């Protein structure tokens, strides 16, 4: 903000009617302090707290020490008493740019005394002068007319602790709205025809995204089948619909003759294309044996699945080992 309100006049500005991307906003990364006591937008990038407000105010450097929960004293008592249990973080950085000095702009005063400390959530914007214990005063140079608003160290300052910090508290005191406005907008690229874990607007699922010809309605976002299982998802970043299917999901059967006769065996992968069989078992096992059965010259495809280690033959014989779909395997040459 070009102009920052004083601590005594901190504004409870709220943010809504849009979706934000904290990652882009964090390009500067000039914040001096990071005190987070919850699911912060920086710490957590998959939530959209609704009742989130960015308090636009400026405080002196030392006051940064008193921006903790349940804090009391000076700023925490009279100027800005944050909620005792506030969900959010406190951000403070030393700029001293708008003030035109390294000491502190005089306009950034801070209320004090008044014998009335703030509540954890209330504000007492008022220009009234502190009342004396013998005769009321409201200005001039009467009896104990001390101005509650005291200017910062406009004179030269040595330590940063006595300088104006553009401190904004990202406290979100959600009451009835779980999440409507997003601070962080973490996102990745798009992958198709590959088994991956996808998170679309909080819907998490493992599958192979593929281009879909379904024509979802403009308001419609997700899709489902008669079984009440997701089978199509719309890209939130573009008017595109992608299907969802299990990655491979097969079973392994060992077509083996009697060990008293031979030891070589065949492997059947249920209802999976042979092209995916090498990746089906990851081919990460011990180099011989399994790898030989992972793929090879003798690979056959059938309604049952992919058979490796058996040589397809035109000749038809009696069913020796039942594989399925009217197809059987035998050890005979």
């Amino acid at each position: 903000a070009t102009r920052f309100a004083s601590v005594y006049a901190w504004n409870r500005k709220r943010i809504s009617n849009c979706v934000a991307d904290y990652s882009v906003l964090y390009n500067s990364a000039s914040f001096s302090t990071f005190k987070c006591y919850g699911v912060s937008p920086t710490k957590l990038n998959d939530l959209c707290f609704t009742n989130v407000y960015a308090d636009s105010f400026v405080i002196r450097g030392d006051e940064v020490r008193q921006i903790a929960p349940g804090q009391t004293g000076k700023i925490a008592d009279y100027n800005y008493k944050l909620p005792d249990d506030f969900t959010g973080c406190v951000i403070a950085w030393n700029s001293n740019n708008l003030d035109s000095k390294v000491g502190g702009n005089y306009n950034y005063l801070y209320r004090l005394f008044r014998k009335s400390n703030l509540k954890p959530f209330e504000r007492d914007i008022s220009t009234e002068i502190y009342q004396a214990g013998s005769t009321p005063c409201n200005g001039v140079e009467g009896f104990n007319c001390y101005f509650p608003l005291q200017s910062y160290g406009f004179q030269p300052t040595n330590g940063v602790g006595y300088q104006p910090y553009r401190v904004v508290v990202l406290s979100f005191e959600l009451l009835h709205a779980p999440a409507t406005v997003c601070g962080p907008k973490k996102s990745t690229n798009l992958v198709k025809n590959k088994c991956v874990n996808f998170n679309f607007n909080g819907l998490t699922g493992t599958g192979v995204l593929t281009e879909s010809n379904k024509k979802f309605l403009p308001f419609q976002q997700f899709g489902r089948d008669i079984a009440d299982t997701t089978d199509a998802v719309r890209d939130p970043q573009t008017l595109e619909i992608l299907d969802i299917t299990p990655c491979s999901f097969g079973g392994v059967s060992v077509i083996t003759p009697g060990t008293n006769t031979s030891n070589q065996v065949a492997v059947l992968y249920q209802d999976v294309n042979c092209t995916e069989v090498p990746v089906a078992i990851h081919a990460d096992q011990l180099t011989p044996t399994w790898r030989v059965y992972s793929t090879g010259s003798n690979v056959f495809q059938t309604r049952a699945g992919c058979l490796i280690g058996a040589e397809h033959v035109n000749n038809s014989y009696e069913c020796d080992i039942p594989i399925g779909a009217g197809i059987c395997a035998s050890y005979q040459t």
Partner: nanobody
Amino acid sequence: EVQLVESGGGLVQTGGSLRLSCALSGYTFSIFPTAWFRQAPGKEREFVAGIRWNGSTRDYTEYADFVKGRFTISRDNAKNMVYLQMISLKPEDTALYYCAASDGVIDGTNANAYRYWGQGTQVTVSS
């Protein structure tokens, strides 16, 4: 640490005049008010005089009724020091004088609220 040093006082004939100096260091004396108190044998500590810097145009001075119209108090922020001028002194004025300052702005008559107190100096008035 905040240090307050009092100088002046001594023995003076009744009806004379005196000047007490209080030098304060270790804090911002310009804005926080400074109060002069006197403690006499058998008497507690009560407000005697005070000076405050409202910050707008002038320094306000408060004087106790029993010494009103005779005691003057002034503050020099550049020198961070306080003058207390007394005229037409009386025998009852014999006492130990302290000068006190506060870490913040407080009521002038609130002696206890003054978190800083100096050693002080003895003043005696003889007929």
